[PDB]
Each structure stands twice: as C-alpha cells, then as structure tokens.
Short mmCIF file of N, CA and C and ligand atoms in Angstrom, two decimals:
data_model
loop_
_atom_site.label_atom_id
_atom_site.label_comp_id
_atom_site.label_asym_id
_atom_site.label_seq_id
_atom_site.Cartn_x
_atom_site.Cartn_y
_atom_site.Cartn_z
N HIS A 2 40.49 14.43 178.63
CA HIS A 2 39.04 14.12 178.92
C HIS A 2 38.37 13.55 177.66
N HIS A 3 37.21 12.91 177.85
CA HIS A 3 36.41 12.27 176.77
C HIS A 3 34.97 12.83 176.80
N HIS A 4 34.81 14.14 177.05
CA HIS A 4 33.48 14.82 177.18
C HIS A 4 33.02 15.39 175.83
N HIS A 5 33.87 15.37 174.80
CA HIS A 5 33.64 16.05 173.49
C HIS A 5 32.31 15.61 172.84
N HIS A 6 31.90 14.35 173.01
CA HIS A 6 30.67 13.78 172.40
C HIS A 6 29.39 14.38 173.00
N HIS A 7 29.44 15.09 174.15
CA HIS A 7 28.28 15.83 174.72
C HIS A 7 28.22 17.26 174.18
N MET A 8 28.98 17.57 173.14
CA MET A 8 29.03 18.92 172.53
C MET A 8 27.60 19.40 172.25
N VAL A 9 27.32 20.64 172.61
CA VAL A 9 26.04 21.34 172.33
C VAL A 9 26.38 22.64 171.57
N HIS A 10 25.48 23.06 170.70
CA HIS A 10 25.60 24.30 169.92
C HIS A 10 24.99 25.44 170.73
N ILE A 11 25.85 26.29 171.28
CA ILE A 11 25.41 27.43 172.12
C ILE A 11 25.32 28.69 171.24
N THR A 12 24.28 29.46 171.47
CA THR A 12 24.12 30.81 170.84
C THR A 12 23.83 31.80 171.93
N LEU A 13 24.21 33.05 171.69
CA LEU A 13 24.05 34.10 172.72
C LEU A 13 22.66 34.73 172.63
N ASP A 14 22.12 35.12 173.74
CA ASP A 14 20.77 35.74 173.88
C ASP A 14 20.97 37.28 174.02
N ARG A 15 20.81 37.99 172.89
CA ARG A 15 20.87 39.47 172.75
C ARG A 15 20.12 40.18 173.87
N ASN A 16 18.95 39.67 174.23
CA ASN A 16 18.05 40.35 175.19
C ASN A 16 18.64 40.44 176.59
N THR A 17 19.60 39.54 176.92
CA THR A 17 20.23 39.48 178.25
C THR A 17 21.49 40.34 178.28
N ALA A 18 21.96 40.78 177.13
CA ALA A 18 23.30 41.43 177.04
C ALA A 18 23.29 42.79 177.71
N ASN A 19 24.36 43.14 178.38
CA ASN A 19 24.64 44.55 178.71
C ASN A 19 24.52 45.37 177.42
N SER A 20 24.03 46.59 177.57
CA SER A 20 23.72 47.48 176.44
C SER A 20 24.96 47.93 175.68
N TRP A 21 26.18 47.71 176.12
CA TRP A 21 27.41 48.06 175.39
C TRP A 21 27.97 46.90 174.58
N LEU A 22 27.35 45.70 174.70
CA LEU A 22 27.89 44.53 173.98
C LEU A 22 27.40 44.51 172.52
N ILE A 23 28.26 43.96 171.69
CA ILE A 23 27.98 43.71 170.25
C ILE A 23 28.07 42.20 170.03
N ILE A 24 26.93 41.62 169.71
CA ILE A 24 26.80 40.17 169.40
C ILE A 24 26.76 40.01 167.89
N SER A 25 27.55 39.12 167.34
CA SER A 25 27.62 38.88 165.89
C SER A 25 26.27 38.36 165.35
N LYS A 26 26.10 38.50 164.02
CA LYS A 26 24.85 38.05 163.37
C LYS A 26 24.57 36.57 163.68
N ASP A 27 25.61 35.74 163.68
CA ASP A 27 25.44 34.28 163.93
C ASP A 27 25.22 33.99 165.43
N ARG A 28 25.26 34.98 166.30
CA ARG A 28 25.04 34.84 167.76
C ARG A 28 26.12 33.92 168.37
N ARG A 29 27.28 33.85 167.79
CA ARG A 29 28.38 33.00 168.29
C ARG A 29 29.56 33.81 168.84
N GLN A 30 29.60 35.13 168.67
CA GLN A 30 30.70 36.00 169.14
C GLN A 30 30.12 37.21 169.87
N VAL A 31 30.87 37.70 170.85
CA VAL A 31 30.47 38.91 171.60
C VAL A 31 31.72 39.70 171.92
N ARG A 32 31.63 41.02 171.81
CA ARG A 32 32.73 41.90 172.24
C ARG A 32 32.13 43.16 172.87
N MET A 33 33.00 43.84 173.62
CA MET A 33 32.71 45.16 174.24
C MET A 33 32.70 46.24 173.15
N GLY A 34 31.62 47.00 173.05
CA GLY A 34 31.63 48.21 172.21
C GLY A 34 32.25 49.38 172.95
N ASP A 35 32.54 50.44 172.18
CA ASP A 35 33.18 51.66 172.77
C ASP A 35 32.06 52.63 173.22
N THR A 36 30.80 52.23 173.16
CA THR A 36 29.63 53.10 173.52
C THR A 36 28.36 52.26 173.73
N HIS A 37 27.27 52.87 174.20
CA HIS A 37 25.93 52.22 174.25
C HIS A 37 25.52 51.79 172.84
N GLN A 38 24.99 50.57 172.66
CA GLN A 38 24.71 50.03 171.32
C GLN A 38 23.29 50.33 170.86
N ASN A 39 22.62 51.30 171.45
CA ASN A 39 21.35 51.85 170.90
C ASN A 39 20.21 50.85 170.98
N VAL A 40 20.19 50.05 172.05
CA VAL A 40 19.09 49.10 172.39
C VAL A 40 18.21 49.67 173.52
N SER A 41 16.95 49.26 173.61
CA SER A 41 16.08 49.60 174.75
C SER A 41 16.51 48.83 175.99
N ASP A 42 16.23 49.36 177.17
CA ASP A 42 16.49 48.65 178.43
C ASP A 42 15.39 47.61 178.64
N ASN A 43 15.69 46.57 179.41
CA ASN A 43 14.71 45.52 179.79
C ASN A 43 15.21 44.88 181.08
N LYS A 44 14.36 44.12 181.74
CA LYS A 44 14.68 43.60 183.09
C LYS A 44 15.70 42.45 182.99
N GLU A 45 15.89 41.87 181.82
CA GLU A 45 16.87 40.75 181.62
C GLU A 45 18.31 41.27 181.49
N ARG A 46 18.54 42.52 181.08
CA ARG A 46 19.93 42.94 180.76
C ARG A 46 20.80 43.07 182.00
N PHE A 47 22.00 42.51 181.98
CA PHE A 47 22.99 42.80 183.04
C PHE A 47 23.37 44.29 182.98
N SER A 48 23.15 45.03 184.04
CA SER A 48 23.35 46.52 184.01
C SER A 48 24.77 46.92 184.34
N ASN A 49 25.46 46.28 185.26
CA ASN A 49 26.70 46.81 185.86
C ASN A 49 27.95 46.26 185.18
N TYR A 50 27.85 45.13 184.48
CA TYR A 50 29.05 44.41 183.98
C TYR A 50 28.80 43.97 182.54
N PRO A 51 29.87 43.70 181.76
CA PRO A 51 29.72 43.33 180.36
C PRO A 51 29.38 41.84 180.13
N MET A 52 28.21 41.46 180.68
CA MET A 52 27.76 40.05 180.76
C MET A 52 26.64 39.78 179.79
N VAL A 53 26.53 38.51 179.41
CA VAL A 53 25.46 38.01 178.50
C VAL A 53 25.27 36.52 178.80
N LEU A 54 24.07 36.02 178.57
CA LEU A 54 23.75 34.59 178.72
C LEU A 54 23.62 33.91 177.38
N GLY A 55 23.89 32.60 177.37
CA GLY A 55 23.44 31.76 176.25
C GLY A 55 21.92 31.61 176.22
N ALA A 56 21.36 31.33 175.06
CA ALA A 56 19.90 31.15 174.91
C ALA A 56 19.45 29.80 175.48
N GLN A 57 20.34 28.83 175.42
CA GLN A 57 19.95 27.44 175.80
C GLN A 57 19.76 27.37 177.32
N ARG A 58 18.79 26.57 177.76
CA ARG A 58 18.52 26.26 179.17
C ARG A 58 18.68 24.75 179.37
N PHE A 59 19.39 24.38 180.40
CA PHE A 59 19.67 22.96 180.72
C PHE A 59 19.11 22.61 182.09
N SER A 60 18.35 21.51 182.18
CA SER A 60 17.73 21.03 183.44
C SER A 60 18.02 19.54 183.68
N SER A 61 18.77 18.90 182.76
CA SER A 61 19.18 17.47 182.85
C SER A 61 20.42 17.23 181.99
N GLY A 62 21.02 16.04 182.08
CA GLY A 62 21.98 15.58 181.08
C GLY A 62 23.38 16.15 181.25
N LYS A 63 24.17 15.82 180.26
CA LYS A 63 25.57 16.18 180.18
C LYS A 63 25.70 17.09 178.96
N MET A 64 26.42 18.20 179.13
CA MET A 64 26.60 19.25 178.11
C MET A 64 28.06 19.68 178.07
N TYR A 65 28.59 19.96 176.90
CA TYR A 65 30.00 20.42 176.73
C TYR A 65 30.02 21.49 175.66
N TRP A 66 30.76 22.56 175.88
CA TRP A 66 31.04 23.56 174.82
C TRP A 66 32.42 24.17 175.03
N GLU A 67 32.90 24.89 174.01
CA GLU A 67 34.25 25.53 174.02
C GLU A 67 34.15 27.01 173.68
N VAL A 68 34.97 27.79 174.36
CA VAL A 68 35.02 29.24 174.16
C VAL A 68 36.45 29.67 173.87
N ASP A 69 36.61 30.52 172.84
CA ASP A 69 37.91 31.13 172.46
C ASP A 69 38.10 32.41 173.24
N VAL A 70 39.23 32.55 173.94
CA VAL A 70 39.59 33.72 174.77
C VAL A 70 40.91 34.37 174.30
N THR A 71 41.35 34.06 173.09
CA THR A 71 42.63 34.56 172.53
C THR A 71 42.76 36.07 172.74
N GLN A 72 43.92 36.44 173.27
CA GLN A 72 44.45 37.81 173.46
C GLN A 72 43.64 38.63 174.46
N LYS A 73 42.70 38.05 175.19
CA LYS A 73 42.03 38.83 176.24
C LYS A 73 42.81 38.91 177.55
N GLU A 74 42.69 40.03 178.24
CA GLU A 74 43.32 40.28 179.55
C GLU A 74 42.37 39.94 180.70
N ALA A 75 41.06 39.92 180.46
CA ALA A 75 40.07 39.75 181.53
C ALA A 75 38.80 39.16 180.94
N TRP A 76 38.19 38.21 181.66
CA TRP A 76 36.92 37.55 181.25
C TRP A 76 36.46 36.66 182.39
N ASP A 77 35.17 36.36 182.40
CA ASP A 77 34.58 35.31 183.28
C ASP A 77 33.84 34.32 182.37
N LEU A 78 33.85 33.03 182.67
CA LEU A 78 33.13 32.00 181.90
C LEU A 78 32.57 30.96 182.86
N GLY A 79 31.40 30.44 182.49
CA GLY A 79 30.88 29.24 183.15
C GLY A 79 29.41 29.07 182.86
N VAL A 80 28.64 28.81 183.91
CA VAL A 80 27.19 28.52 183.79
C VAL A 80 26.53 29.14 185.04
N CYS A 81 25.28 29.62 184.95
CA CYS A 81 24.57 30.22 186.06
C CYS A 81 23.11 29.81 186.04
N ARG A 82 22.47 29.96 187.18
CA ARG A 82 21.00 29.72 187.29
C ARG A 82 20.27 30.78 186.44
N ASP A 83 19.19 30.38 185.75
CA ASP A 83 18.41 31.30 184.90
C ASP A 83 17.97 32.49 185.74
N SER A 84 17.75 32.35 187.05
CA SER A 84 17.19 33.45 187.86
C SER A 84 18.23 34.31 188.61
N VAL A 85 19.50 34.27 188.19
CA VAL A 85 20.51 35.16 188.80
C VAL A 85 20.06 36.63 188.67
N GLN A 86 20.41 37.39 189.70
CA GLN A 86 20.31 38.88 189.70
C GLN A 86 20.94 39.47 188.44
N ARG A 87 20.29 40.45 187.85
CA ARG A 87 20.74 41.14 186.59
C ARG A 87 21.19 42.57 186.91
N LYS A 88 20.62 43.21 187.95
CA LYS A 88 20.81 44.66 188.21
C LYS A 88 21.68 44.88 189.42
N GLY A 89 22.52 45.89 189.40
CA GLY A 89 23.35 46.25 190.55
C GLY A 89 24.60 45.41 190.69
N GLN A 90 25.25 45.54 191.83
CA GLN A 90 26.53 44.90 192.13
C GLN A 90 26.28 43.54 192.77
N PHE A 91 27.10 42.55 192.41
CA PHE A 91 27.06 41.20 193.01
C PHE A 91 28.38 40.49 192.74
N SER A 92 28.71 39.51 193.57
CA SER A 92 29.89 38.64 193.36
C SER A 92 29.47 37.37 192.62
N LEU A 93 30.40 36.82 191.86
CA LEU A 93 30.21 35.52 191.19
C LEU A 93 30.53 34.43 192.18
N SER A 94 29.53 33.70 192.67
CA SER A 94 29.69 32.64 193.69
C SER A 94 28.58 31.64 193.49
N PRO A 95 28.74 30.41 193.94
CA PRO A 95 27.65 29.44 193.92
C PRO A 95 26.47 29.90 194.79
N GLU A 96 26.72 30.60 195.88
CA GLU A 96 25.60 31.13 196.73
C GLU A 96 24.72 32.06 195.89
N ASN A 97 25.29 32.82 194.95
CA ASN A 97 24.52 33.75 194.09
C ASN A 97 24.13 33.09 192.77
N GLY A 98 24.31 31.78 192.59
CA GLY A 98 23.85 31.08 191.38
C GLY A 98 24.83 31.01 190.23
N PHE A 99 26.14 31.15 190.50
CA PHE A 99 27.17 31.14 189.43
C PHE A 99 28.24 30.06 189.69
N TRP A 100 28.64 29.36 188.63
CA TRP A 100 29.76 28.37 188.63
C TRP A 100 30.70 28.76 187.52
N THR A 101 31.76 29.49 187.89
CA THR A 101 32.57 30.27 186.92
C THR A 101 34.06 30.19 187.29
N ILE A 102 34.88 30.49 186.29
CA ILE A 102 36.33 30.80 186.45
C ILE A 102 36.57 32.13 185.73
N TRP A 103 37.71 32.71 186.02
CA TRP A 103 38.07 33.98 185.38
C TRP A 103 39.56 34.18 185.27
N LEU A 104 39.89 35.10 184.35
CA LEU A 104 41.22 35.72 184.24
C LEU A 104 41.11 37.18 184.66
N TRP A 105 42.07 37.62 185.48
CA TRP A 105 42.12 39.00 185.97
C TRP A 105 43.54 39.30 186.42
N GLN A 106 44.16 40.36 185.85
CA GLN A 106 45.51 40.80 186.30
C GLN A 106 46.44 39.62 186.28
N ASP A 107 46.52 38.93 185.18
CA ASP A 107 47.55 37.92 184.91
C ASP A 107 47.43 36.70 185.85
N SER A 108 46.31 36.53 186.56
CA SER A 108 46.06 35.30 187.37
C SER A 108 44.68 34.74 187.04
N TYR A 109 44.58 33.43 187.13
CA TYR A 109 43.30 32.68 186.93
C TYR A 109 42.76 32.25 188.28
N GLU A 110 41.45 32.41 188.49
CA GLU A 110 40.79 32.04 189.77
C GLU A 110 39.41 31.42 189.52
N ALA A 111 39.03 30.47 190.37
CA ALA A 111 37.67 29.92 190.38
C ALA A 111 36.80 30.78 191.29
N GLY A 112 35.56 31.02 190.82
CA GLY A 112 34.54 31.82 191.52
C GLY A 112 33.89 31.10 192.67
N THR A 113 34.66 30.54 193.59
CA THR A 113 34.20 30.12 194.91
C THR A 113 34.10 31.31 195.85
N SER A 114 33.58 31.12 197.07
CA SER A 114 33.54 32.20 198.07
C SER A 114 34.27 31.75 199.34
N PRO A 115 35.49 32.27 199.60
CA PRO A 115 36.20 33.20 198.74
C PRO A 115 36.85 32.49 197.53
N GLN A 116 37.34 33.28 196.59
CA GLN A 116 37.89 32.76 195.31
C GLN A 116 39.10 31.85 195.54
N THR A 117 39.29 30.94 194.60
CA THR A 117 40.34 29.90 194.67
C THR A 117 41.36 30.13 193.57
N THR A 118 42.65 30.17 193.90
CA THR A 118 43.75 30.25 192.92
C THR A 118 43.80 29.04 192.02
N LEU A 119 43.92 29.24 190.72
CA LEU A 119 44.09 28.17 189.73
C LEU A 119 45.58 28.07 189.37
N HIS A 120 46.00 26.91 188.92
CA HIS A 120 47.42 26.59 188.61
C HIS A 120 47.47 26.26 187.13
N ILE A 121 47.79 27.23 186.31
CA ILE A 121 47.82 27.10 184.83
C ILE A 121 49.24 27.47 184.34
N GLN A 122 49.93 26.50 183.80
CA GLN A 122 51.32 26.67 183.27
C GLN A 122 51.25 27.16 181.82
N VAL A 123 50.22 26.75 181.08
CA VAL A 123 50.05 27.11 179.63
C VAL A 123 48.82 28.00 179.47
N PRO A 124 48.95 29.33 179.36
CA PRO A 124 47.77 30.20 179.31
C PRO A 124 46.84 29.74 178.22
N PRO A 125 45.55 29.46 178.51
CA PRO A 125 44.65 28.94 177.51
C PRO A 125 44.22 29.98 176.49
N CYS A 126 44.13 29.54 175.25
CA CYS A 126 43.47 30.30 174.17
C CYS A 126 42.03 29.81 173.96
N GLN A 127 41.71 28.57 174.34
CA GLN A 127 40.30 28.06 174.32
C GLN A 127 40.06 27.22 175.59
N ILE A 128 38.86 27.40 176.15
CA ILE A 128 38.40 26.80 177.44
C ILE A 128 37.26 25.85 177.08
N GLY A 129 37.30 24.61 177.61
CA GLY A 129 36.16 23.70 177.52
C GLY A 129 35.40 23.67 178.81
N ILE A 130 34.06 23.69 178.70
CA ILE A 130 33.15 23.71 179.88
C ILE A 130 32.23 22.49 179.81
N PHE A 131 32.26 21.70 180.86
CA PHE A 131 31.46 20.47 180.96
C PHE A 131 30.52 20.62 182.15
N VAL A 132 29.23 20.33 181.92
CA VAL A 132 28.18 20.32 182.97
C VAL A 132 27.54 18.93 183.02
N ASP A 133 27.54 18.32 184.18
CA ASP A 133 26.74 17.08 184.46
C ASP A 133 25.65 17.50 185.44
N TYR A 134 24.42 17.67 184.93
CA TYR A 134 23.33 18.21 185.76
C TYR A 134 23.03 17.27 186.94
N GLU A 135 22.85 16.01 186.63
CA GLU A 135 22.43 15.01 187.65
C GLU A 135 23.51 14.83 188.70
N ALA A 136 24.77 14.80 188.31
CA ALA A 136 25.89 14.62 189.23
C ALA A 136 26.18 15.89 190.04
N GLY A 137 25.74 17.06 189.61
CA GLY A 137 26.10 18.32 190.28
C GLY A 137 27.58 18.70 190.05
N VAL A 138 28.02 18.66 188.80
CA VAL A 138 29.44 18.91 188.44
C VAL A 138 29.50 19.97 187.35
N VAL A 139 30.44 20.91 187.52
CA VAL A 139 30.86 21.83 186.44
C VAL A 139 32.40 21.76 186.36
N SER A 140 32.93 21.40 185.21
CA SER A 140 34.39 21.28 185.03
C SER A 140 34.86 22.14 183.87
N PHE A 141 36.10 22.58 183.99
CA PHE A 141 36.77 23.50 183.05
C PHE A 141 38.06 22.83 182.59
N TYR A 142 38.34 22.94 181.28
CA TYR A 142 39.48 22.26 180.64
C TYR A 142 40.26 23.27 179.81
N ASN A 143 41.57 23.05 179.79
CA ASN A 143 42.54 23.89 179.01
C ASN A 143 42.72 23.25 177.63
N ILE A 144 42.04 23.72 176.57
CA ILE A 144 42.10 23.05 175.26
C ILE A 144 43.52 23.25 174.70
N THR A 145 44.15 24.37 174.97
CA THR A 145 45.52 24.69 174.43
C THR A 145 46.51 23.67 175.00
N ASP A 146 46.31 23.17 176.22
CA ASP A 146 47.20 22.17 176.89
C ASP A 146 46.58 20.77 176.84
N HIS A 147 46.18 20.31 175.66
CA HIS A 147 45.72 18.92 175.41
C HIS A 147 44.57 18.59 176.38
N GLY A 148 43.75 19.58 176.74
CA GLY A 148 42.51 19.26 177.48
C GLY A 148 42.72 19.11 178.97
N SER A 149 43.82 19.55 179.51
CA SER A 149 44.14 19.35 180.94
C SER A 149 43.06 19.99 181.83
N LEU A 150 42.78 19.39 182.95
CA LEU A 150 41.80 19.96 183.92
C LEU A 150 42.31 21.26 184.50
N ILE A 151 41.41 22.25 184.53
CA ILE A 151 41.61 23.53 185.23
C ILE A 151 40.97 23.48 186.61
N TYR A 152 39.67 23.12 186.68
CA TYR A 152 38.92 23.21 187.95
C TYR A 152 37.62 22.39 187.83
N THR A 153 37.24 21.74 188.94
CA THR A 153 35.95 21.04 189.09
C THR A 153 35.22 21.57 190.30
N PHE A 154 34.03 22.14 190.05
CA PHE A 154 33.01 22.38 191.10
C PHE A 154 32.20 21.07 191.24
N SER A 155 32.22 20.49 192.43
CA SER A 155 31.39 19.32 192.70
C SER A 155 30.44 19.63 193.86
N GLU A 156 29.46 18.72 194.05
CA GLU A 156 28.37 18.93 195.05
C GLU A 156 27.64 20.25 194.75
N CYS A 157 27.47 20.52 193.47
CA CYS A 157 26.77 21.75 193.03
C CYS A 157 25.27 21.66 193.37
N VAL A 158 24.71 22.75 193.87
CA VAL A 158 23.24 22.81 194.11
C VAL A 158 22.70 23.81 193.09
N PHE A 159 22.40 23.36 191.88
CA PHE A 159 21.98 24.25 190.76
C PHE A 159 20.69 24.98 191.14
N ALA A 160 19.69 24.25 191.65
CA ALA A 160 18.42 24.80 192.19
C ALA A 160 17.62 25.51 191.09
N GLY A 161 17.77 25.12 189.84
CA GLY A 161 17.02 25.72 188.74
C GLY A 161 17.62 25.35 187.41
N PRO A 162 17.01 25.76 186.31
CA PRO A 162 17.60 25.61 185.00
C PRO A 162 18.92 26.41 184.92
N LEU A 163 19.85 25.88 184.16
CA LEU A 163 21.18 26.54 183.97
C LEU A 163 21.25 27.16 182.58
N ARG A 164 21.98 28.28 182.50
CA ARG A 164 22.32 28.94 181.24
C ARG A 164 23.83 29.15 181.11
N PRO A 165 24.39 29.00 179.90
CA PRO A 165 25.79 29.39 179.68
C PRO A 165 25.97 30.88 180.03
N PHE A 166 27.08 31.20 180.69
CA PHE A 166 27.37 32.54 181.22
C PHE A 166 28.71 33.04 180.67
N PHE A 167 28.74 34.35 180.31
CA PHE A 167 29.89 35.02 179.68
C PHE A 167 30.06 36.42 180.27
N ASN A 168 31.30 36.81 180.48
CA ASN A 168 31.66 38.23 180.76
C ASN A 168 32.88 38.53 179.89
N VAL A 169 32.74 39.50 178.96
CA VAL A 169 33.88 39.87 178.08
C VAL A 169 34.88 40.74 178.83
N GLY A 170 34.50 41.26 180.01
CA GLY A 170 35.35 42.21 180.78
C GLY A 170 35.35 43.62 180.23
N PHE A 171 35.73 44.55 181.11
CA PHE A 171 35.94 45.96 180.73
C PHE A 171 37.18 46.08 179.87
N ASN A 172 37.29 47.22 179.22
CA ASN A 172 38.48 47.51 178.39
C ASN A 172 38.99 48.91 178.78
N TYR A 173 39.29 49.09 180.05
CA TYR A 173 39.94 50.35 180.53
C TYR A 173 41.36 50.42 179.98
N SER A 174 42.07 49.31 179.78
CA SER A 174 43.50 49.27 179.40
C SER A 174 43.70 49.50 177.90
N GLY A 175 42.66 49.31 177.08
CA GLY A 175 42.86 49.24 175.63
C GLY A 175 43.50 47.94 175.16
N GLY A 176 43.71 46.96 176.04
CA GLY A 176 44.29 45.66 175.70
C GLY A 176 43.26 44.53 175.80
N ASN A 177 41.99 44.81 176.06
CA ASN A 177 40.98 43.75 176.27
C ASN A 177 39.80 43.87 175.30
N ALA A 178 40.00 44.37 174.08
CA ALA A 178 38.89 44.55 173.12
C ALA A 178 38.49 43.24 172.45
N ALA A 179 39.36 42.23 172.46
CA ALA A 179 39.09 41.01 171.67
C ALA A 179 37.78 40.35 172.13
N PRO A 180 37.09 39.66 171.22
CA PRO A 180 35.83 38.98 171.55
C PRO A 180 36.00 37.66 172.33
N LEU A 181 34.91 37.22 172.95
CA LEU A 181 34.70 35.78 173.26
C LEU A 181 34.02 35.16 172.05
N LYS A 182 34.45 33.97 171.66
CA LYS A 182 33.85 33.28 170.49
C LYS A 182 33.50 31.86 170.90
N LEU A 183 32.32 31.42 170.53
CA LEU A 183 31.93 29.99 170.67
C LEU A 183 32.54 29.23 169.51
N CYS A 184 33.37 28.24 169.82
CA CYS A 184 34.18 27.49 168.80
C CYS A 184 33.32 26.41 168.19
N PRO A 185 33.53 26.12 166.89
CA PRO A 185 32.78 25.10 166.20
C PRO A 185 33.08 23.73 166.81
N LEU A 186 32.04 22.89 166.80
CA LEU A 186 32.04 21.42 167.04
C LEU A 186 32.97 20.72 166.05
O1 JMM B 201 26.51 24.97 194.49
C1 JMM B 201 27.26 25.08 195.46
C2 JMM B 201 28.67 24.73 195.25
C3 JMM B 201 29.28 23.88 194.38
C4 JMM B 201 30.67 23.94 194.64
C5 JMM B 201 30.83 24.85 195.64
O2 JMM B 201 29.62 25.33 196.03
N1 JMM B 201 26.77 25.57 196.62
C6 JMM B 201 27.50 25.64 197.89
C7 JMM B 201 27.43 27.04 198.46
N2 JMM B 201 26.04 27.43 198.66
C8 JMM B 201 25.55 27.73 199.89
O3 JMM B 201 26.26 27.54 200.87
C9 JMM B 201 24.21 28.31 200.06
C10 JMM B 201 24.09 29.64 200.72
C11 JMM B 201 23.66 28.44 201.44
C12 JMM B 201 25.30 27.42 197.39
C13 JMM B 201 25.39 26.07 196.70
#
C-alpha cells in the first residue's frame, strides 16, 4: 500500500481509559495493570473491558497510523464513533459504531456482525490502520508481511466523528501483559 503519507500522530485519552489501564507519560503506550489505577470514575471510561480511545477526532480526510502488538495473545484495534456506549456489555460491530479487527485464541477476526474469519499466514507484530472518511473505508494492513492487506470495511456509515479505538485485552492467562504501542512515523 501507499497510505504512509497520511500518517497522523495519535495519543491516548486517559479520561476514556478503563480504570485498570496504565498509559505512558508520552500517551503513546497502554497496558493492563494488575489492579485499579487509583483514578476517579467518569461517564467517558469504558467500564467492562480494557478499552481506551485516542484523543484525536476525525470528521474528514484520509488518516493512517500503526500499532505494535508484539507478544500479545488478545487485543482489538480500529476506529469507533465518538458516541459509542462506554458502560455495560456490548459487541464490537458497525451497528454499535465500531470498525475493528481482533486476535483471540490464536485466530484473527473482523468485527462484522456476525464476525468474519481473517486469513493471516504471518502473525503481525505491527498493524497499519487506514481511514478514508469521505469514501467510507477502514482498512487494516500487516506491517510484518510487507504491508499486505488484512481486511477492508467498505460502505461504512460512520454517522459521527471517529476516534482511534484500542483494547489491550484481559490477562487471565499471564501471557497477555504486553502493551499496545503507537509506532513512530
Ligand atoms: O458501517 C457499516 C458497515 C461497514 C461495513 C460493514 O458495515 N454499517 C452497516 C451495518 N449497519 C446497520 O445495518 C445499521 C443497523 C442498521 C451499521 C452501518
């Protein structure tokens, strides 16, 4: 792909984070803590899952960023509507305002309803995410495999400003403590 020139500098929004997440001082890394991180509750925080939003809001244009997922067993990545539900249980779907892929139990899937199996021969250590607001496209790329396409959501109905979306996943196994990291331009 040739989307690299639309690179944007993404930072994480502490105020949206689940209360167990630890965001680095530079706001470029997030990981699961082993306990509540001693923050006050607010209506923006994801309550049920280890999720956080980027600070940036997109309502036009073409945007590209990269995320490091090295050594993780479980995660979700993509983009969501600023007004997604924060509290309680919900599925990741375009009907609920999410355009995402994930790793879970050694398989990769796109967050369609119902979910779609992905075909990845080279497990990615870094994921590229491309958004074309006007075209209604969200695409995912395997940076470890020379940028190969993972998945394209097309005919997207964003219906609002978009925010970068992250889930570091639970760490019930003791094998999923590693962070998500926003990779340098
Ligand atoms: O954004 C998308 C989309 C892009 C790719 C796949 O779906 N959609 C379609 C599914 N949706 C609905 O059907 C709405 C409940 C009516 C929500 C918008």
